[PDB]
């Protein structure tokens, strides 16, 4: 009766970044909520937010590579980015453990490959054993090697992970905790008449997310998008007591 839950990198990281930083209050609270609901089976994915975007964008990870001088620089940037995202994960696991959750991380760059930006290989047997042993596996948006020889590496997002693993683990619920209430007709931060959709079916950042999810819903698994920045929402979603959000179908 398993649940897969994504924590958007925007909810748990802070952008007013001298350096990358946790949103400690959002993080410790969400952990508390995961503890209070105590799901029977759980897997978590989290976005990188300020520990990821800034570095991978600086180095253009996932973009064609023109010359050997590009290449040498990007190879360094892949490594620097992977360490930054690992440090966020270690904060993540700190907060979970602090709440008694046996969070076990699985670094995507150590067992996942991409081809042209799409997950090409992911071992799922180890994740399954962690789940079987009663642990909480935690994956996260990360940089991975890309067998497309123009690219060499890609960023695999929290959202591709949620899609790839929910397809294959066939969880009962897929919950995406984001920093807005749901999907809207329009970017509700640029458009005053954006309306909150309670369910989605086609196209009618956050677009990226929906495209990914629409692949998943089309294979018969539905997800829910809720605001994690709103107290209790994670705890209620994990309890199965409907919350404000959008279902993708």
Ligand X SMILES: Nc1ncnc2c1ncn2[C@@H]1O[C@H](COP(=O)(O)OP(=O)(O)O)[C@@H](O)[C@H]1O
Q: Does 44 bind ligand X (CB under 6 A)?
A: no
Which residue in 110, 124, 170, 207 binds a copy of itself (CB under 8 A)?
A: 110
Q: How far is the CB of 60 from a copy of itself (least distance, A)?
A: 16
Q: Which of residues 161-220 bind a copy of itself (CB under 8 A)?
A: none
How many whole angstroms from its chain centre is CA 90? Answer: 15
User: Rule CB under 8 A: is residue 102 a binding residue for a copy of itself?
Assistant: yes
Applying CB under 8 A, among 109, 157, 160, 166 the residue interacting with a copy of itself is 109
CA distance 98 to 106: 19
Among 2, 32, 54, 113, binds a copy of itself (CB under 8 A): 113
Positions 50 through 89 that interact with a copy of itself (CB under 8 A) = 72, 75-76, 78-80, 82-83, 86-87, 89
90 lines the binding site for a copy of itself (CB under 8 A):
yes
Q: CA 243 to CA 240: how far, in whole Å?
A: 8
Known binder of ligand: residue 6? yes
How far is it, in rounded angstroms, from Cα 11 to Cα 178?
Answer: 6
* Phi, psi of 183, rounded to the nearest 5 degrees: -85, 140
Query: Distance (Å, rounded) from C-alpha 152 to C-alpha 79?
Result: 13
Q: Is 47 in the site for ligand X (CB under 6 A)?
A: yes
Interaction between residue 187 and ligand X (CB under 6 A): yes
Label residue 16 exposed, middle or buried (CB < 10 Å: 0-12, 13-18, 19+): exposed
**Chosen from ligand X, a copy of itself, none, partner binding at 184 (C-beta under 5 to 8 Å by type):** ligand X
Buried b (16+ CB within 10 A) or exposed e, 190-220: eeeeeeebeebeeeeebeebbebbbebbeee
Q: Is 122 annotated as a binding residue?
A: no
């Amino acid at each position: 009766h398993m649940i897969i839950l994504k924590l958007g990198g925007s909810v748990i990281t802070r952008k007013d970044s001298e350096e990358p930083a946790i949103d400690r209050d959002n993080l410790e609270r969400i952990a508390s909520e995961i503890g209070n609901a105590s799901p029977s089976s759980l897997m978590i994915v989290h976005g990188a937010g300020s520990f990821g975007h800034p570095f991978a964008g600086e180095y253009r990870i996932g973009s064609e590579i023109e010359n050997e001088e590009d290449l040498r620089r990007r190879r360094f940037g892949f490594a620097l980015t992977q360490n930054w995202v690992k440090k966020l994960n270690s904060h993540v696991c700190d907060a979970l453990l602090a709440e008694g959750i046996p969070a076990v991380s699985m670094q995507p760059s150590a067992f996942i490959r991409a081809h042209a930006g799409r997950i090409s290989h992911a071992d799922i047997s180890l994740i399954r054993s962690y789940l079987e042993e009663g642990m909480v596996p935690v994956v996260y948006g990360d940089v991975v090697l890309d067998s497309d020889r123009r690219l060499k590496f890609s960023v695999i997002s929290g959202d591709q992970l949620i899609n790839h693993f929910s397809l294959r683990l066939m969880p009962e619920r897929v919950i995406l905790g984001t920093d807005v209430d749901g999907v809207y007709t329009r970017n509700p931060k640029k458009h005053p008449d954006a309306r909150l959709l309670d369910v989605i079916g086609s196209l009618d950042g956050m677009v990226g997310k929906i495209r990914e999810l629409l692949l998943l819903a089309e294979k018969g698994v539905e997800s829910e998008i809720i605001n994690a920045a709103v107290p209790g929402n994670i705890e209620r979603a994990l309890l199965g007591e409907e919350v404000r959000g959008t279902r993708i179908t």
